[PDB]
């Protein structure tokens, strides 16, 4: 009586999160109030709003001088918020071209001042990232951003470059707290909370300080990161919601074994998958190059479309939700977020080993 | 074990409602997910955001040729969005300065384009608001805003002007589905949903279509209204927990009998605690001139601060939540939105009884 749920963004929520906040919904630790009826100034919200930016930091080792935000509008607002805030005239803002994610994030930054290409993965069609490693940029550069998780194409980061003065900006959007990193490589990172950490309606912005300290004054009120600093994302009202429940899964990811405990369990399943992909005697075929495997958003063909659509069609009748591919990519995508269980990537292989001898 | 909530924002739900979404939070219509673990493009969640629309709309009459959207970054967003998309070179965007919200709707415009005060009431210290049968306006207008129900103040519109083509656009966050109005005479209306529809981290705008077929294409994509037009709200990942929670706002609403309903209800509410206000002997006294006063915020005072301080903490201890009003104001602030029951109003204006002969 639970989906297999591959869902790609919103996505799976981990049961017991989902009890404990069904339990709650009605009434609040008893204040006779839901945690949705409360004010967002009041100390009880107040104390989940910043146990949930704390406990964020604590997954990723505490790193001094970064502030966790609560901003509104999806990982799509920060495509424009971030050249807004730091792409200063005579700058040049540069991007890694990885797949459907980079070339959003670049087209919005294009309406907002220069841009560049500082790598890309095009010529491989997206299956082979670039080696970041060495890559060259100007003194004008505002910042280098990449996506960690290219979460259409399947293909992910396994390292970030030291840019050194430039500040290295990161969406990870679809595989934030999936895995331990070093937050101080990073001016910036950001995540729709939608596929790894809850609800729609709240983005993670995670920002070092001295980066924000002052943000441009032409900039509408909402769309400076110091508004968000120094009024502690309460300038206006927060999703409070949806941080809420944000905060419910950052305490299940502890309960998990924190980010080396959850990146474990997502290795997993996510070689499961990928071995059920690699014996399959070409039947399954992955899309992307086996050192830019996603564990996140596995992407996989067979020899033709007519037999990714019987795929599509027969997982759904056996209760998988979500498989079907972008249809940039085509194929499949199997989404294992953090909640996913192993269970359902079991049942998916499972599938995968059914449907391939049912047509066989 | 319900408190009296009297919360200005985020606020009261009805009970009904949380018992619902309570209800079916782990598991809706036994689809073995949770409406937040869902496809914002799958048929389930869409069935949700769409009927959520069309009982808007039916709300207020079923008027054609207005689109309802869905857009995160609460009415505070709306106060930078509005002007970006309609305040062309050359063009004024004229206000209604009736106090705190419309200052901050002001202010925001300030930074995109030329802005005029069109009328004002703070001459009255806000207390009267201003005449607006007449106001005159230029050619140039590119709209008139207003702040339908000045949340802060408590002070409220009773009717609009008819502006010809210039538009009038109307903040209507904190009296919005509390009373008819004729949509027609607006080019947009918006209101953050966590007033009185629902949960923070929605905000709905109602759009007259013709005047968002064609939105500047100098604008990030996100602060565009035809991005949401054309894309049904649905270009990115929508707040898709607060849309289903607006939903069952608006099916509550219907059940209570509508707008024309729900102000008779709220008039009554209303009713009792200005009447406790006006027959207080003095003791309590209105913020704002009688024709001015809101049904959705009750602003008073009494003698002196430390009065009010004693109002407020004893309040506290009695279980009533919310009620000390905003320093600009000073004093009390009793909202009382749709979703805050006429019970709540009853133990209120019976407190104020209590407390004012417990002075006496
Ligand atoms: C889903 C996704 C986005 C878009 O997020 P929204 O909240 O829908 O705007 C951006 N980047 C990545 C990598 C994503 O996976
Ligand atoms: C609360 C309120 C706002 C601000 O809404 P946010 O969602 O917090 O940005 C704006 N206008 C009015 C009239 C309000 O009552």
């Avoid at 200063?88 to 220069?114: P, R």
């Avoid at 924190?258 to 997993?268: F, P, Y």
């Avoid at 399943?269 to 005697?281: F, H, M, R, V």
Wanted: aromatic share 10%.
């Amino acid at each position: 009586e639970r989906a297999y749920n591959f869902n790609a963004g919103p996505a799976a929520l981990p049961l017991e999160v989902l009890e404990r906040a069904q339990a709650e919904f009605v009434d609040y630790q008893h204040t006779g109030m839901s945690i949705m009826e409360m004010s967002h100034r009041g100390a009880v919200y107040e104390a989940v709003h910043n146990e949930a930016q704390a406990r964020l930091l604590a997954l990723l080792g505490n790193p001094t001088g970064y502030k966790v935000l609560f901003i509104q509008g999806g990982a799509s607002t920060q495509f424009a918020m971030i050249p807004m805030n730091f792409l200063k005239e005579g700058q040049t803002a540069n991007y890694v071209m990885t797949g459907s994610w980079a070339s959003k994030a670049l087209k919005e930054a294009k309406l907002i001042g220069d841009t560049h290409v500082a790598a890309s993965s095009e010529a491989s069609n997206y299956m082979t990232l670039p080696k970041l490693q060495e890559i060259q940029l100007q003194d004008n550069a505002a910042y280098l951003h990449l996506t960690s998780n290219e979460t259409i194409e399947g293909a992910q980061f396994k390292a970030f470059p030291d840019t050194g003065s430039v500040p290295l900006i990161g969406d990870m959007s679809s595989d934030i707290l999936s895995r331990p990193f070093d937050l101080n490589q990073f001016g910036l990172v950001y995540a729709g909370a939608q596929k790894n950490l809850g609800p729609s309606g709240v983005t993670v912005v995670i920002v070092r300080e001295d980066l924000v300290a002052e943000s441009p004054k032409h900039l509408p009120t909402m769309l400076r990161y110091d508004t968000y600093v120094k009024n502690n994302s309460l300038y206006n009202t927060p999703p409070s919601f949806g941080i809420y429940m944000v905060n419910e899964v950052l305490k299940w990811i502890e309960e998990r074994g924190g980010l080396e405990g959850v990146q474990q369990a997502n290795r997993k399943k996510a070689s499961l998958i990928y071995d059920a992909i690699d014996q399959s005697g070409g039947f399954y075929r992955g899309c992307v190059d086996v050192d830019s495997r996603s564990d996140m958003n596995i992407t996989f063909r067979l020899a033709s479309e007519e037999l990714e659509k019987e795929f599509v069609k027969a997982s759904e009748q056996e209760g998988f939700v979500g498989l079907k591919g972008h249809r940039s990519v085509g194929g499949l995508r199997a989404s294992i977020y953090n909640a996913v269980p192993y269970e359902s990537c079991e049942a998916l292989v499972q599938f995968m080993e059914h449907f391939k001898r049912s047509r066989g």
